[PDB]
């Protein structure tokens, strides 16, 4: 009797891969969204800066990195996968406050 429409799929991944340039990626990402390692790290793997900073300083290779770090690395790479449109917003959501100028 008329009416009828549905859809909206669902993702399904498990332990994604990580790139060796994961570091350069983040840095670039930040320089892209012009966000703070904090905001990102927060929307990356729920972390801070002092940490992410060390991850960008030591750049613990994802080949030797420890599960602890890898856990983050994986997360990050998972975030860098998100849609630019999202990341743009995700970041904005974090900042929470445009205040032109």
From Swiss-Prot:
UniProt subcellular location: Nucleus matrix
Glycyl lysine isopeptide (Lys-Gly) (interchain with G-Cter in SUMO) crosslink residues: 8
Residue location of crosslink Glycyl lysine isopeptide (Lys-Gly) (interchain with G-Cter in SUMO2): 8
Source superkingdom: Eukaryota
Tissue: High expression in adult brain, moderate expression in fetal brain, and weak expression in adult liver, kidney, and spinal cord and in select brain regions, including amygdala, corpus callosum, caudate nucleus, and hippocampus.
DNA-binding region per UniProt: 8-95
Record text on subunit structure and interactions: Interacts with ATF4 and RUNX2; resulting in enhanced DNA binding and transactivation by these transcription factors. Interacts with PIAS1.
Protein name: DNA-binding protein SATB2
Organism of derivation: Homo sapiens
Range of the intact protein held here: 350 to 437 of 733
